Every structure is written in structure tokens, then in C-alpha cells.
């Protein structure tokens, strides 16, 4: 899986597949905390029967551990629980002990297959493309130095100048650009506003100076 | 009526004038301001907003270089931050050029100088300013994004404050923390909302894709130290982040990508984008097409083929390698070293290494 | 007359009236 | 787009430098009328 | 009523945000330190005034009454510090 | 299932159907590599315990092939690894492999059902119904050549 | 101020041609390039 991110079918994969495995750390860690209770507790409620049980499945801790562990698989069995003698208050509570932790096992599962989904569903728009590329160029960096010739088993044998002008250039064709895109934003309520009033000084204006003709005239009237 | 008056009775001549002013009735604010001499022109409206703030936010120049040539009239210093805020360049350039902002230096100085003086300039009410009292009006500029702004206030002096470190022992960060530790904190961050805006990042510095790589870096850091406005520093992470990528999608030769790649080929900007994880910027198909030519420096031929001949060279590197490698030693310097120091072929003389390591542990085990 | 909060909150709720008046003005036309 | 209302306000922008030079036209001929009579 | 009860809890918060010093913060939270407001809040709640980075900044330091220097520590070195209570 | 496009009812359940067969041809590789790993490793730890162990679960290539492969549905026992000697460290390392294998299936297993509901989100509004339009036409037009 | 210049000091007679001719003042244009 090292040299996988170079590939361009299986490095998404690869990728994809690592960020997983961060994700699930934690809510690894809350199953953890959920797996010591009731290993503790079938493990005490079972230790005083060691030759009293059909299989040795909760006497000591480490079989304790077993029982639990492989029966998220589900490769344990119910006898797991039965005891030989006639104790069944014991033997009842292993049951329901038993029973209520596979059922919270399956919500702890629940709730991990639906926030990894949630996640997934919230980073959309082509991010595993840019996150593929960007593990595949730290591969080929590492091999852009010229240290790393021969593979480890055979490695044994022993006024301006011309960056201030394009930058120059860039940085304006940038502002450019960006004006530019302002300019494609959708246009406000309050930019509309800013040309009905353009338009409200206009009138005022136009219409004064309408009337100014008129009293203009006026007084060449009274002249004559 | 109201339970808060934000403004009394407001005559009739002083509610007329009002009215003129915010709907640009410029023939009749030009009759009041020269003829009457029964108005104040700091009458306010019913939101504690005066002639010269309403003409301002209405966008009428006209009224605007009217009412700035009236002598006392106030909120002068808050009208440029409302010009600033909504972009209006020309009002911007109307109100820098009245005597208030001319004469002093108030665009140069700090807005801790600024602060130190009470001297109520860009308080917009009886008690208050409309944004931050740190915001000076290059901050602001910045914030909008205002290209032509930032331009004007870059000419007159004004550069953003550059806060110091976050654990800072000096006698200001020592004051300011203790003094109120919560306007010092959002205080932080509208010095670098201005810092990380595409608007002054490209206008300010010699070299703004390293500059905004650097902040982009300490940005992200600030994050982690400041939990609780954690979303405000990554977004402004962000901002800086996409500022790289925004200039280094312009490129449209090689001499360009090498410039913004290459730094002043070293990738110095290609290890400082992974160092500093700009994934947009190092898997931009610019970048890609540079770092993939190095890829294939000597194999020009290969470049195109299919991926089951590119599987068929690495099983006769496989097949072939302590021959490779003992030709390598007698000719380090030669078609045969030219083509083993390409960086593929580096990379497929590992990967066929490690398969043949999986082929011994597999055929031990034969038996 | 007014007390220390009664003036906080006047500040803070002319505030928001302009602050709302500008985020009217941002939506789309 | 923001763009395109720019250029309706540029529009009539332009259309305010033209009336307003229109108006101040017939004030100056009206002005040398009054000369001549 | 559903729709009309967010828009009075999004009023709160939208005043909420506005804060810019700590005597404005103190009038919100703390209504005319008793976090009488954060206390409603919770008590109806309205989660965004109380999740907001205004709000939160006050409990954190309430939270760090004479801890000055474990409020920046690694939660290794909290953990330890939990090793060494216990 | 040739003939399956030709209905409106089961026409797009076929195409859709074939569509998850080809992605997960490629998370499948992934597995394989995986799925090798543990069958080399673990029939190394048990090749010399031919008649030591409960069963001949990891003894011989094929017979870990089989223990493995059929520990995917859950049709392998634990006694798979229990060793009759008192060899407790090679039984315990049996115990660790076994169960970290079973831990990197479902790993794997998850990140191949996440990954597809991803790719399916994003290839919404109305393309189902193109899909299988398409796949109909095309046997349709085998059809219309009078040869046949 | 600016590290860059895109473009000095602009005389009165060229900033407020610049002015006229991107507002669209027409009459000053046509005043500016025909007497000037
Ligand atoms: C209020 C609190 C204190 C109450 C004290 C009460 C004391 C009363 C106790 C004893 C008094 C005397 C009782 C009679 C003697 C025994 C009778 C008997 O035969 O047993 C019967 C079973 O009995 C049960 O099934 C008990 C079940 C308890 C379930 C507890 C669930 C805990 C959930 C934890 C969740 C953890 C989650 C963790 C986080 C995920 C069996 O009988 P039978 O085989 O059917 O008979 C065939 C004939
Ligand atoms: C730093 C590196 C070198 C370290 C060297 C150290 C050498 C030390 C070795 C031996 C020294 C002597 C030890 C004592 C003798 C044996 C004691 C014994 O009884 O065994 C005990 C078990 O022992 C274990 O459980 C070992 C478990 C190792 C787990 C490895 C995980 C690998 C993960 C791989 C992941 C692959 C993932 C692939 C990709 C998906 C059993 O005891 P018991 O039955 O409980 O006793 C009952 C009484
Ligand atoms: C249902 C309610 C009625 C049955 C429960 C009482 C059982 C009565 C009893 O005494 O007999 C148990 C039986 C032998 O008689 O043996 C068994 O098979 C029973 C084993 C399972 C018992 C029920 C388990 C319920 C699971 C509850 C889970 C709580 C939620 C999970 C926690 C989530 C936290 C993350
Ligand atoms: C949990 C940590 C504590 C337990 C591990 C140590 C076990 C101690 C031991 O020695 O005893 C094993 C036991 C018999 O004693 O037998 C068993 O049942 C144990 C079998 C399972 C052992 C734990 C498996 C953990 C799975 C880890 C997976 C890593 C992530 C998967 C990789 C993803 C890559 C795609
Ligand atoms: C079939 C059995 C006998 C051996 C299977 C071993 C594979 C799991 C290994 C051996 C060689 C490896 C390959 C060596 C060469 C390459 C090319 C490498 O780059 C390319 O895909 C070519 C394009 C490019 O390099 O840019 C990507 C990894 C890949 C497929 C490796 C993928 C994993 C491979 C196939
Ligand atoms: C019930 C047992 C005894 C036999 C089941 C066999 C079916 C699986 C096969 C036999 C005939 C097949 C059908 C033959 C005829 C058609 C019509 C064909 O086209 C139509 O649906 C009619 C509309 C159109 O052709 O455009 C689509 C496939 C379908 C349903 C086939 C579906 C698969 C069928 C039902
Ligand atoms: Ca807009
Ligand atoms: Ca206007
Ligand atoms: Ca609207
Ligand atoms: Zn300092």
C-alpha cells in the first residue's frame, strides 16, 4: 500500500481507505470503553464457576476478553452462558448480560456506519481528487532527490528584476481576474437600491432645471 | 410609542431637509444649505442617522461634496467608514479630501493611537461607532474586499497592524489582556480578517503567494491555540489558502509556473504548500503538469504508454536488477545512469525491490 | 435617568436594526 | 449579475452628463438672446 | 409555531453576536456573575446562544477561575494533572 | 438477465445492478491484497503444526486460503487457531492475526459500502433513468438489422 | 505605499479626463479632446 498512491485507478482507494481508518479510531475508542464494562462484569459474575459452566467461555479475564471479542463476529455461542448447576438467577442474568451487550454492540456499529456517512456526504465536490493528487505528489517528491539512487538491498555496497516582473504581471492579472468575478455575484436588494436613488437625484435635477427654463422665460416675457 | 428612541419632535425645516438629503433632492439641500439660517445640519432622522450619513449610504455624491463643504458638520469620520463599507469610491474620494482627513494623519496612525485619543472622529452616535472601534478604515477596506479602496488608503500610508504574537509578555498585550482579554480577542481577529483578504494580500506586500503561505500557516495555528473561535481562524486559514491556488491558476507559460513554483528547480513553494497541507495549490493541474515533467526527465517515451506497459518495465526491472545495479556501479554516468536516475525509475527500482523481498518471503516457505 | 444596562441595550439593539437593514440589502433582488 | 446592473447604472450615469449639458445649452442661448434684445 | 418559535431563539442569538466588548457580553448573558440569560437559554433551549463563541468565551473562563496557565495546556498534561488528583 | 433491460419494472435494477459490480471490482483488488497478507503470514505460523492443531484450518496454502475466505461470512470456527501443544505463543499470535484479520475485513468491508453511497449521491437528478434508456436502445437495435 | 504600481502623480488635466471618460461624461470628452 505504500507504492499504491501512485496509480491513478487504485490511489483514490487507498486514500479513501486511510481516512476511514483515522475515522473510526475514535468511535473505536467508545466501543473500547463499552467492552471493558461488560468484560469486567460477566467476568466476576462468572469466576466463582470454573468447573460449573458448559465451556470456560467468562471464568477468568483473558477468556472473558475471548468470548467478548469473538462475539462481534458472531462466532460465539449461546452456551457461553449456561451453567451446570441449578443457579439460574446467575445463569439468567448472564443471559440478559449477555443479550443487552450484542444489542449495544449493534447500535455502537449503527452510530459509527451513519457518522462516517454524514461525514462523506459533507465533503462532496471533488475533494478525493485533489486529496489523491496531493498524496501522489509527496510520492514523487521523495524521489526527486538524487540521494535515493539504488533500493535498500543494494544500497549496502557503498532595476527590477525578472521574478519582480512576473510577479508584477501576476498580481495584476489577478486583480483583474477578481474584479471580475465580483462582477458575476449576484446583484443585491441593496444594489438595486443604489440605482433607484441614482434615478430619484436625476429627477430632482432634470425637473429643476426644467423649471428654470420656464422662470427663464418669464422674465424675458416681462422684458418685453 | 417605542421602547427605545434611537434619535426631539424633528421640525418641520430639519425633517424637509432630511428628506432632501437621503432621496438626492440636490436642488433643494443646495437652497437650505446656502439660504436658511434657522437649521443645524446634524439634525438626525429617527435612527440617529444626520444629513451626511444618510447622502452617504444613498450613494449621492452630489449632496455628499454639498454638505462637505459645510463648515462643522459632524460624523465625518464615520461617513468614510460607511463609504468604505459599501464601496462607493467616489464618495471615498470626496471625504478624503476634506480638511479632517488632509490635515491630519489620521489614515497613518495605528488604531491603538487612534483609540488612546477619545476624540469621538468615527463615533456615528451620541455613544458608539457603527463597526468595531478597532477597525480602522484600511481594516475595513480590507474586509470588503474593495480593491480600489485599499489602493487609496495604500497611497495615503494606512497598513494593517500586524498584532503581535499570541503569547505576547509586552506591556500592550499585558494591558489589553487584562483590561477586558474578550475585545483583545476579537481584536485579533479583525486585524487578520484584513491581513488574509485577497484585497490586501495582493496590494500591500512584495511577494503575496509567499506572504499568504506564511499566513496560511499561522492562521491554522492560531486555531488550534484559540479553541473557542476556532472556526473564524480556519476560515481565514482558508482565505489565504485559496489566495495561492487563485494565483497560481493564472499562469500561462512556464516561465510564470516556474516563478510562483520555484519560489525566486528547487519546489521551494511546492514543499511549502505540502508543509503547510495547500492541497488545491500542489494538486492544481499547473503544479501537476510541472512536478510530473520531472517525473519523466528521461523518459520521454514512456510518459504516454499504457499501464500494462509501464507493469511489463517494472517486471523487467524486477528480472533484471542486480544487473541494472551492477552496471550502475561500473557506469554511474551513462545512458544506463542517466535513465536510473530518473525519478520513475528510482521510484519502480523500489517498488520492484520490495516484490522480489515478497517473492523470498513467499519461496521460503515452498517446501 | 437610564441605567448602565438600559444603555447597553440600546446601543446593542440599534445595533441590530442596522445590522438587519444591511443583511435585507444583501438578499437577492 | 452585479456586472451587468453596473453597466445599467453606467447607462444612466451617462444619460445624467447629457440632460444636464442639454438644459445648460438653452440657459446660455436663452442668456445671449437677452444680449442681443 | 414551530417556524415562529426559531425565529425568536435566531433573534437572540442574532443579538448575541453583535457583542463586542465584555461589558456587552455581560449585559447578555448575565440579563441586568448569575448567567441568568444562560440559564433560560438552556432551560428553553436555545442552543445557538448558547454554543456561540460570545457565549462560550465567558464559561471558558469561569470554567478557568485560578487555573491561568492549565487553560493553554496540552490534554496530555491535563491528563496527567488528572493522574495526580486521583 | 440479458433480456432483464428490455422492462420498465427491473430495466434499471439490472443497470444499476451492473454498475456496483464494476466499482467494486476495484475495492475488491484492495481486499485481495489484504486477504493475501494474512493467508501467507498465518499458514508460515502454522505449516509445522500439521497434526498439533484442532482442525487443518492455516496448515497448507489452500486449506488458509479456505479458512480465511470462509471467515468472511462468519463460517469459520475460533478453533481455527487453538494448537493441541502447550505452545501458547504461537497459539496467542494464531489468536491476534485471526482477529485483527476479521477487524481489517470489516475496515474494508465499511469503507467500500461508505465509498459507493458517496459516488451514488452524486449521480442524482434523473440519470437512472438515461442510464437504462440507453441500455435499452442498444438492445433494441440488435434487433432491428433483419438477419437475425 | 503599494509594493506594486500598476500604472505618475497623474496631472488634474489627465485624472479628470480619466474621470470624465470612465463615468461617460460626454460633454467633457468631446470638450477635452477637441480643445485641448
Ligand atoms: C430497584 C433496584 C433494586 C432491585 C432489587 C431486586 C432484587 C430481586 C432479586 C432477587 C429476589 C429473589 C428473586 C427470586 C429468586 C430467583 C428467581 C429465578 O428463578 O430467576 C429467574 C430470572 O431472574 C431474572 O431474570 C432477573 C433479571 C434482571 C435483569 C436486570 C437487567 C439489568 C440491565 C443492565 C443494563 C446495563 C447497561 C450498561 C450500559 C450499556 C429465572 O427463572 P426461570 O429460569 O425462568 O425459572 C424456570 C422455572
Ligand atoms: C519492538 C519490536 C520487537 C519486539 C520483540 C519482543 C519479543 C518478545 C517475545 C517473546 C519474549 C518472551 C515472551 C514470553 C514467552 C511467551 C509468553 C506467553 O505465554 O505468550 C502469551 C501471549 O503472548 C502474546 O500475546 C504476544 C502478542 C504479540 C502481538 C503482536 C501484534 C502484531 C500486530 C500485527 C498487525 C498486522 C497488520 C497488518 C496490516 C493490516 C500467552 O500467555 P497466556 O496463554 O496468557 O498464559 C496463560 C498462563
Ligand atoms: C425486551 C424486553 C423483555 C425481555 C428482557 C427481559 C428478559 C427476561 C429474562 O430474565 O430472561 C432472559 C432470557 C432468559 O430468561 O435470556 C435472553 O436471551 C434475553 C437476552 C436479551 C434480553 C433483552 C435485551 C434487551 C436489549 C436492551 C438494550 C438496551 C439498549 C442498548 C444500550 C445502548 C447504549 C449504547
Ligand atoms: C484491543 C487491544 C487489547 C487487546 C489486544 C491484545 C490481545 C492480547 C493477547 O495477546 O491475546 C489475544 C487473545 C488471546 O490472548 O485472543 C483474541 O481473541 C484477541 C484477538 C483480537 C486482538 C485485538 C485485535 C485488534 C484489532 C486491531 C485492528 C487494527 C486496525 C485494523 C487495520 C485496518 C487497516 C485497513
Ligand atoms: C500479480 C502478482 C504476481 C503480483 C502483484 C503485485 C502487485 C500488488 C504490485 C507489484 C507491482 C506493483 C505496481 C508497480 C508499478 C505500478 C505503476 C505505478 O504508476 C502507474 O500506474 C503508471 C503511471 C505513473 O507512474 O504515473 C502505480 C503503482 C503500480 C501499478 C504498482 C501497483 C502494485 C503492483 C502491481
Ligand atoms: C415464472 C417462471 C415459470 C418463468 C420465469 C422466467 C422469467 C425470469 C423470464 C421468462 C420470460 C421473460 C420475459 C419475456 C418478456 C418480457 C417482456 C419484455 O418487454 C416488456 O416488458 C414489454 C414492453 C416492451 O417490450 O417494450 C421485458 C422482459 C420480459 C418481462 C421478460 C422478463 C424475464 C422473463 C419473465
Ligand atoms: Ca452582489
Ligand atoms: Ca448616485
Ligand atoms: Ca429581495
Ligand atoms: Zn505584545
Known sequence: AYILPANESFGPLQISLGRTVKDIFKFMVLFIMVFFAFMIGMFILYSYYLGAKVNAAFTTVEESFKTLFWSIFGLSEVTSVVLKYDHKFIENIGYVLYGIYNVTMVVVLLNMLIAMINSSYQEIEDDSDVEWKFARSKLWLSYFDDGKTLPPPFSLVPQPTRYQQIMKRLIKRYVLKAQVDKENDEVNEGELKEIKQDISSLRYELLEDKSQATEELAILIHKL | ?367
Not at chain 2, 449610504?57 to 463643504?69: D, I, P, R, W, Y
Not at chain 2, 459645510?70 to 480638511?99: C, F, Q, T, W
Not at chain 2, 485599499?150 to 497592524?161: F, N, S
Not at chain 2, 524486477?318 to 561500473?330: D, E, K, N, S, V
Request: charged share 25%; net charge negative; proline share 4%.
Open chain 2, 1 to 367: 410609542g417605542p421602547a427605545f428612541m434611537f434619535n426631539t419632535s424633528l421640525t418641520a425645516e430639519e425633517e424637509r431637509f432630511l428628506d432632501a438629503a437621503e432621496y438626492g433632492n440636490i436642488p433643494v439641500v443646495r437652497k437650505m444649505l446656502e439660504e436658511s439660517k434657522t437649521l443645524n445640519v446634524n439634525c438626525v432622522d429617527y435612527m440617529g442617522q444626520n444629513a451626511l450619513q444618510l447622502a452617504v449610504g444613498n450613494e449621492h455624491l452630489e449632496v455628499t461634496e454639498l454638505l462637505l463643504k459645510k463648515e462643522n458638520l459632524a460624523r465625518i469620520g464615520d461617513a468614510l467608514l460607511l463609504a468604505i463599507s459599501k464601496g462607493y469610491v467616489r464618495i471615498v474620494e470626496a471625504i478624503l479630501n476634506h480638511p479632517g482627513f488632509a490635515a491630519s494623519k489620521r489614515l497613518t496612525l495605528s488604531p491603538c493611537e487612534q483609540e488612546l485619543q477619545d476624540d469621538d472622529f468615527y463615533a456615528y452616535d451620541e455613544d458608539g461607532t457603527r463597526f468595531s472601534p478597532d477597525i480602522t478604515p484600511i481594516i475595513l477596506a480590507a474586509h470588503c474586499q474593495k480593491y480600489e479602496v485599499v489602493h487609496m488608503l495604500l497611497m495615503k500610508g494606512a497598513r494593517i497592524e500586524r498584532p503581535h504574537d499570541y503569547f505576547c509578555k509586552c506591556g500592550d498585550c499585558m494591558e489589553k489582556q487584562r483590561h477586558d482579554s474578550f475585545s483583545h480577542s476579537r481584536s485579533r481577529i479583525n486585524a487578520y480578517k484584513g491581513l488574509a483578504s485577497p484585497a490586501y494580500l495582493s496590494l500591500s506586500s512584495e511577494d503575496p503567494v509567499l506572504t499568504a503561505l506564511e499566513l496560511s500557516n499561522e492562521l491554522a495555528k492560531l486555531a488550534n491555540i484559540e479553541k473557542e473561535f476556532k472556526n473564524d481562524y480556519r476560515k481565514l486559514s482558508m482565505q489565504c489558502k485559496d489566495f495561492v491556488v487563485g494565483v497560481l491558476d493564472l499562469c500561462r507559460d512556464s516561465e510564470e509556473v516556474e516563478a510562483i513554483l520555484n519560489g525566486d528547480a528547487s519546489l521551494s513553494r511546492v514543499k511549502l504548500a505540502i508543509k503547510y497541507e495547500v492541497k488545491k495549490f500542489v494538486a492544481h493541474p499547473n503544479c501537476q503538469q510541472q512536478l510530473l515533467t520531472i517525473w519523466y526527465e528521461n523518459l520521454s517515451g514512456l510518459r504516454e504508454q499504457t499501464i500494462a506497459i509501464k507493469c511489463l518495465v517494472v517486471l523487467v526491472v524486477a528480472l533484471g536488477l542486480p544487473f541494472l545495479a551492477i552496471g550502475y556501479w561500473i557506469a554511474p554516468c551513462s545512458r544506463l545512469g542517466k535513465i536510473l536516475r530518473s525519478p520513475f525509475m528510482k521510484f519502480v527500482a523500489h517498488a520492484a525491490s520490495f516484490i522480489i523481498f515478497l517473492g523470498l518471503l513467499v519461496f521460503n516457505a515452498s517446501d
